[PDB]
């Protein structure tokens, strides 16, 4: 997250770190959202590679174990069947991960609330992006979970020629793009949490930024619009 600050410890308790095994250790690769005790929502591109993945719930500092974490293997990966690795702008950048065990819900580990099917937020709606991603374009991963206010940019503006043009689809949410605050590498798969009727719901799954950098004016961070996928999500969970 570019332009953000350290999040209050465990204050986004559905935020997960998706990690792959790397030599004698594990490496953070992406964010995700816990949506059931044994299901995580992330980006499809995060699981392109056929690696050994785990999810960490209750995480805050990637480099110290603080007693709130639970570490659980990814057992089954269900990518949206229309996702194409070679065509990110087509959309469908979403995957569900069934965990090898159910996590224990507690004050540090909670389910993320999803929007109602079809929900579109008004332009400039209040949202926060969270993640352990780079804190500057070509910078360093965050040791501690970061957050930044990233208000929505509606479809009509985001898909205009001066922003993303036809690259952005109505199955996506855009947020930010003032050239100041943004997601960045290591944040993808994670949530965009948007305030609706006093409750945060996860409206976005972080997908892509400009190839010029993370915080780029008129290139807001682009997310998979979770409310476009509610039926898909429910179908996957019910059949697995």
């Amino acid at each position: 997250v570019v332009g953000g600050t350290e999040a209050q410890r465990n204050s986004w308790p559905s935020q997960i770190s998706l990690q792959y095994r790397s030599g004698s250790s594990w490496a953070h690769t992406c964010g995700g959202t816990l949506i059931r005790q044994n299901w995580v929502m992330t980006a499809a591109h995060c699981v392109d590679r056929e690696l050994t993945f785990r999810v960490v719930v209750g995480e805050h500092n990637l480099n110290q174990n603080n007693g709130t974490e639970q570490y659980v293997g990814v057992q089954k990966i269900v990518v949206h069947p229309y996702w194409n690795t070679d065509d990110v702008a087509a959309g469908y950048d979403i995957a569900l991960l069934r965990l090898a065990q159910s996590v224990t819900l507690n004050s540090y580990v909670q389910l993320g609330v999803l929007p109602r099917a079809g929900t579109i937020l008004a332009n400039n709606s209040p949202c926060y992006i969270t993640g352990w991603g780079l804190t500057r374009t070509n910078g360093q991963l965050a040791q501690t979970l970061q957050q930044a206010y990233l208000p929505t940019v509606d479809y009509a503006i985001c898909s205009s020629s001066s922003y993303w043009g036809s690259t952005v689809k109505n199955s996506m949410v855009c947020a930010g793009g003032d050239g100041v605050r943004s997601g960045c590498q290591g944040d993808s798969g994670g949530p965009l949490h948007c305030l609706v009727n006093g409750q945060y719901a996860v409206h976005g799954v972080t997908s892509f930024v400009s190839r010029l950098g993370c915080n780029v004016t008129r290139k807001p961070t682009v997310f998979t619009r979770v409310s476009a996928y509610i039926s898909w999500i429910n179908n996957v969970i019910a059949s697995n």
């Binding site: 591109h45 991603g133 944040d187 993808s188 997908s207 892509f208 930024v209 190839r211």
Partner: peptide, 8 residues
């Protein structure tokens, strides 16, 4: 664009 990961 560029996906958010390393480096997709």
């Amino acid at each position: 664009x560029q996906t958010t990961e390393f480096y997709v």
